[PDB]
């Protein structure tokens, strides 16, 4: 790692600066360096890691979708070639994230909060691989298995309003609808998740209430599209 010579605390500080500067590639590199130090990531640091790679892969996914749409309408080699270039770059980022999770974030995640967070990430980055795969079958199964393990732990160890649990269920429901050809599973998961969170809002402070209802909005938006 080219970040191996930098102190962990300096990598975290620079990741926070990169976020403020909207330099998400730098942010991701700094957070990869921090992970590779081999110590726990705190809740804040896990959020930094996730935000950084979500923004990097998000731009790649948006580009890939533009190019894939152009390639489809065209049906010279240039559109295919450039789509393949972006696709390879996207796969490389996903492989990098999955490698951090497998060596050794997940096994070293010594409580439910941290293990669920990383297993949700594992589902997400296999899902992004599935979006461009054609082999696609294996990736889909890996994403479902990671999401489901995360769900099982989260249902045992977190309340139904916990925002990590809510965002996990939201993204698993998107997986079912958009990737796995399981729209009924998507609807069932989003609806039960929404309803069980609603019935638990009375237990929350004003600030936690805001956290939970933000994700609940996204569940509602999908259910409105899907039904």
């Amino acid at each position: 790692g080219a970040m191996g010579s930098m102190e962990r605390a300096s990598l975290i500080q620079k990741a926070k600066l990169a976020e403020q500067a909207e330099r998400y590639e730098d942010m991701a590199a700094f957070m990869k360096g921090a992970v590779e130090k081999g110590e726990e990531l705190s809740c804040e640091e896990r959020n930094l890691l996730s935000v950084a790679y979500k923004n990097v892969v998000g731009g790649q996914r948006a580009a890939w979708r533009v190019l894939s749409s152009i390639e489809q309408k065209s049906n010279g080699p240039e559109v295919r070639e450039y789509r393949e270039k972006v696709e390879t770059e996207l796969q490389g980022v996903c492989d990098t994230v999955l490698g951090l999770l497998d060596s050794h974030l997940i096994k070293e995640a010594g409580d439910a909060e941290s293990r669920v967070f990383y297993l949700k990430m594992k589902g997400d980055y296999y899902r992004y691989l599935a979006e461009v795969a054609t082999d696609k079958k294996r990736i889909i199964d890996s994403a479902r298995s990671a999401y489901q393990e995360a769900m099982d732990i989260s249902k045992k160890e977190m309340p139904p309003t916990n925002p990590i649990r809510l965002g996990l269920a939201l993204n698993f429901s998107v997986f079912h609808y958009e990737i796995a050809n399981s729209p009924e599973e998507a609807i069932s998961l989003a609806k039960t998740t929404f309803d069980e969170a609603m019935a638990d809002l009375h237990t929350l402070s004003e600030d936690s209430y805001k956290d939970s209802t933000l994700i609940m909005q996204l569940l509602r938006d999908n259910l409105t599209l899907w039904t």
């Binding site: 993204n171 998107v174 609808y177 958009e178 998507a186 996204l218 938006d221 999908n222």
Partner: peptide
């Protein structure tokens, strides 16, 4: 397209 965590 469906909306993921954002």
């Amino acid at each position: 397209r469906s909306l993921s965590e954002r």
